[PDB]
């Protein structure tokens, strides 16, 4: 389920920025926590990477679909390109 994977990927980023902002002082966090923070800011990062990797297959299929579609359009292009010529000939012949 690549969609759920994009969801959790977005939650982690949130809580990552949270934990950092605390650690870095911006938000409050009492001293004895300074550790829990740093540890979190590492578990979350690893989770993100893992999650991102698991997403590759999905983005590859997309890579394929883009190929296919590019092809398809290119072909329809050639067909169009020929129909043009026929009309141009028709002109030189009629008008």
């Amino acid at each position: 389920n690549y969609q759920y994977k994009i969801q959790e990927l977005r939650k982690l980023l949130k809580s990552l920025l949270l934990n950092y902002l605390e650690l870095i002082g911006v938000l409050s966090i009492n001293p004895d926590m300074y550790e829990r923070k740093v540890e979190n800011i590492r578990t979350i990062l690893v989770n993100i990477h893992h999650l991102l990797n698991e997403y590759r297959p999905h983005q590859s299929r997309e890579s394929l679909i883009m190929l296919l579609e590019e092809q398809l359009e290119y072909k329809r292009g050639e067909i169009r390109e020929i129909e043009q010529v026929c009309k141009q000939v028709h002109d030189k012949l009629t008008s």
């Binding site: 590859s60 997309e62 000939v89």
Partner: protein, 114 residues
């Protein structure tokens, strides 16, 4: 996909910045050798980039193609595209057949010296 790669490379750079920050913080002042008003400057410039990188990453994730699409669908769209390919190529052979058929016709009249 390139966007997927830019997202990887992006996440990579941020992971490093968090490390440069954690180790800069941790090692120098355990966050309470460099002066006070100094440790403050960098800490902000280091955390400022981390905030922008988080935005950039969220935008890339948003722009990932088929981001709101499942696998089941992707597989359908691929089968649908392969089928349309077979067709568009059948059309293409026909279009070429005819163009070529016509060209021969002209060539005929011309070699006929007319």
């Amino acid at each position: 996909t390139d966007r997927m790669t830019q997202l990887q490379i992006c996440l990579d750079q941020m992971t490093e910045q968090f490390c440069a920050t954690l180790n800069y913080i941790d090692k120098n002042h355990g966050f309470e050798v460099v002066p006070p008003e100094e440790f403050s400057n960098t800490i902000d410039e280091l955390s400022t980039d981390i905030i922008l990188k988080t935005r950039q990453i969220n935008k890339l994730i948003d722009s990932l193609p088929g981001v709101d699409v499942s696998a089941e669908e992707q597989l359908r769209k691929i089968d649908m595209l392969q089928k349309k390919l077979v067709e568009v190529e059948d059309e293409k052979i026909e279009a070429i057949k005819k163009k070529e058929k016509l060209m021969r016709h002209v060539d005929s009249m011309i070699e006929d010296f007319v």
